[PDB]
Symmetry: D2
């Protein structure tokens, strides 16, 4: 897919280049049922006015990666998956380079999957983490 999001449907409401993810440049590298990775090159579109990666950008990258890692498994079982909680904590800022995210699945329940997502800079330092709780529900249409 665009951004390499999992291809689980024949068509999507919004094309990759037009979504938030498309606009800021998020790209998924690996995806398996228990772990997924994605990254993004830092440009001003990712920053706040003070020149640092925007807090919302780490949240969004985590959210898309954990959500979609769940969608990759559950869609074909007739479920929808959507984030119900995103708790991101910020340890070190990023000014430039890339942000690289790794989502590790820690719980796969029938109604909720939980992913721990680490967000690292190009030196490998842990700049933020997000705890992503993803609701899983039967698709209604």
């Amino acid at each position: 897919t665009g951004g390499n999001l999992p291809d689980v449907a024949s068509h999507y409401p919004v094309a990759y280049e037009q979504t938030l993810d498309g606009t800021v440049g998020f790209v998924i590298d690996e995806m398996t049922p228990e772990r997924a990775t994605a990254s993004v090159e830092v440009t001003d579109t990712l920053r706040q006015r003070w020149g640092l990666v925007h807090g919302g950008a780490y949240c969004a990258l985590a959210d898309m990666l954990a959500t979609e890692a769940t969608v990759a498994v559950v869609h074909e079982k007739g479920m929808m998956a959507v984030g119900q909680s995103n708790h991101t904590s910020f340890f070190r800022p990023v000014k430039e380079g890339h942000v690289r995210a790794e989502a590790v699945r820690i719980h796969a329940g029938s109604t909720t999957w939980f992913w721990d997502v680490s967000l690292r800079d190009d030196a490998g330092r842990l700049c933020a983490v997000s705890s992503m709780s993803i609701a899983v529900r039967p698709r209604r249409d």
Copy 2:
């Protein structure tokens, strides 16, 4: 200039090039205890399934709470930056606007905390964000 608080003569990134400008965040009211902001839904704010992106609610809450703290503390020699953002999602938004209201609930020497509500065009509570804002002396 998204109407962000004018606290400095120069900013490293212009509004229109920032994430906030790209998606269209605009601050309406700002006081030390309460601030509001809003955005029109466009595809730039959406994920590929046509709903407002989880990260969009987080980014709105984050810029609002953070810059409402900057508004007070910058002229006191302090830098303010988000240290935790906990957003929870109750109802999706497909189109219209998202409107945020940040209510300051704690203002301590090193941390300010804001409860942010994110509502749709019908006034319904779609999400909430608990924003924890670190306050530290500006590094010369």
Copy 3:
């Protein structure tokens, strides 16, 4: 009930005085479907070794009050309610007196209710807050 917890069943697995809540002295004052209050007199049983109310005590009081405020409504509809996330943030410590909690319902969905709980000292100051997310599920037995 003991602690004035909502009386929704003819019998309970564990008596009030023997539970955590019983042991530390939590007591519910008001309960309605949208708001509930409870308090606790501070004694050493509530404190950590450094003499301050234990971080776990604020979490527990919030958790019981939001959970039970949900149970008060949903039990008689055949649902069980149990906390799925408790996010407590700590602003000011308490050394002695009481901790008073007020739970305000902010979302009542079919699977999740969400309560904002403020925890105040005897001077009325806001010492901690907890965001309580309560899963609601049909009872299995």
Copy 4:
């Protein structure tokens, strides 16, 4: 003395009278990067429905993460205390033990952060706690 780190000659509250002593928390391993603790389930740890109290997992995570920070920073003149505890609950515990393992993931000048896992007697992950620990100069 729940085996908490011995960093001071006197403590305001004895172990047995603290919340930790009343419910039975005991620290096993403690190093600067990783600590473990456990408790036997008894009714004192339970809510009236017979399951381990939500607050019990939070209190375990909180004392473990906090005191693993005290272990390092106290002798450096610093006080450490929890500023946020985010616990999420995946599976209940009716009886047996709860075992916690705190892994330090960030150690900054003013905040240390610990990922705490809470497991049952079968090793299953029952809950997790993200502990944010504020570190400040001790007030003389």
